[PDB]
Amino acid sequence: FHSFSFYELKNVTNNFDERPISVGGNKMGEGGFGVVYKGYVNNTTVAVKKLAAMVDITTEELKQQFDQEIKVMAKCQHENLVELLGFSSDGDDLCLVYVYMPNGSLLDRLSCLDGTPPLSWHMRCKIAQGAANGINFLHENHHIHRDIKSANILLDEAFTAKISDFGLARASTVMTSRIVGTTAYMAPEALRGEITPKSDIYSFGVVLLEIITGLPAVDEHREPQLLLDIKEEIEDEEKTIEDYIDKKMNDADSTSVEAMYSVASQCLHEKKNKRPDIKKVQQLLQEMT
Numbered sequence: 001f002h003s004f005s006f007y008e009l010k011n012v013t014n015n016f017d018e019r020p021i022s023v024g025g026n027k028m029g030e031g032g033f034g035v036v037y038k039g040y041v042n043n044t045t046v047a048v049k050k051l052a053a054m055v056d057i058t059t060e061e062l063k064q065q066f067d068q069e070i071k072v073m074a075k076c077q078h079e080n081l082v083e084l085l086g087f088s089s090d091g092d093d094l095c096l097v098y099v100y101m102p103n104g105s106l107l108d109r110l111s112c113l114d115g116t117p118p119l120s121w122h123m124r125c126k127i128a129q130g131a132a133n134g135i136n137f138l139h140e141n142h143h144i145h146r147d148i149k150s151a152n153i154l155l156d157e158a159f160t161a162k163i164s165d166f167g168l169a170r171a172s173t174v175m176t177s178r179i180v181g182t183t184a185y186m187a188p189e190a191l192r193g194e195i196t197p198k199s200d201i202y203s204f205g206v207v208l209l210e211i212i213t214g215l216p217a218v219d220e221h222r223e224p225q226l227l228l229d230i231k232e233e234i235e236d237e238e239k240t241i242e243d244y245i246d247k248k249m250n251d252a253d254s255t256s257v258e259a260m261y262s263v264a265s266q267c268l269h270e271k272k273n274k275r276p277d278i279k280k281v282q283q284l285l286q287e288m289t
């Protein structure tokens, strides 16, 4: 990967202009570990992630996540993983430079952030297949992602799904004392500190529910607050998947929606050993289409 000067990245992002693009700035997104800015290097549009302790972690832990991301990127190259172009470690803050994803995150496209048109059911099926292909590549290469979520599924110029954020990824059960991930997506065993690829399957199940419903995984002003709770409502015959299907599509059919819900439901088994592995998930998503 190309070594950038912090100052060149500062220069091409209009001094890390924290205002969103929609208001004239360079900010494309943000999370607990940093902010993503639109940049322009050598006649190529790029994304620059500037690392920052947004959700309280140490500078040493932020540096370990920076090193882990570069290490995972050097070992894992695939059609369904975002491509790292370079990094910066010389100046004021750590930066990671990526291939520009013109369609941003699946989370933002599902919410239609900035007025983007809703994703068709056809597009959503391709995205789910692509994301499963990327997770499959990771598990085949003995890596556990640990943070599968719609904010970590990016969308390129062809709406091809690209899994992102490998700062927490682990080479492979095993237990840890540092419980990390996004709670609204975490498997029960992951919440207890277990490190297993079976947890990535569970989180992917939550992503499939977001794809079907267009609803975020957590919404404090919604009943139920957690999306994974709709599975219980459907199972207990209180509601149907039909009641939750995203209304912002005109090309969905009952058969393929029920087929995707069935995959999501199997991924969301509370007992890790009853969940399908990633290869079975891929097969089921291929059969859906």
Ligand SMILES: CC[C@@H]1[C@H](F)C(=O)N[C@@H]1COc1nccc2cc(C(N)=O)c(OC)cc12
Binding pocket: 028, 029, 030, 031, 032, 033, 034, 035, 036, 046, 047, 049, 082, 098, 099, 100, 101, 102, 104, 105, 108, 151, 152, 153, 154, 164, 165
């Ligand atoms: C700090 C934000 C976190 C983290 F960066 C991540 O992987 N998921 C989150 C959201 O990220 C993004 N949101 C919108 C748009 C985004 C475009 C790109 C991109 N290559 O053009 C991007 O690259 C990595 C991240 C983008």
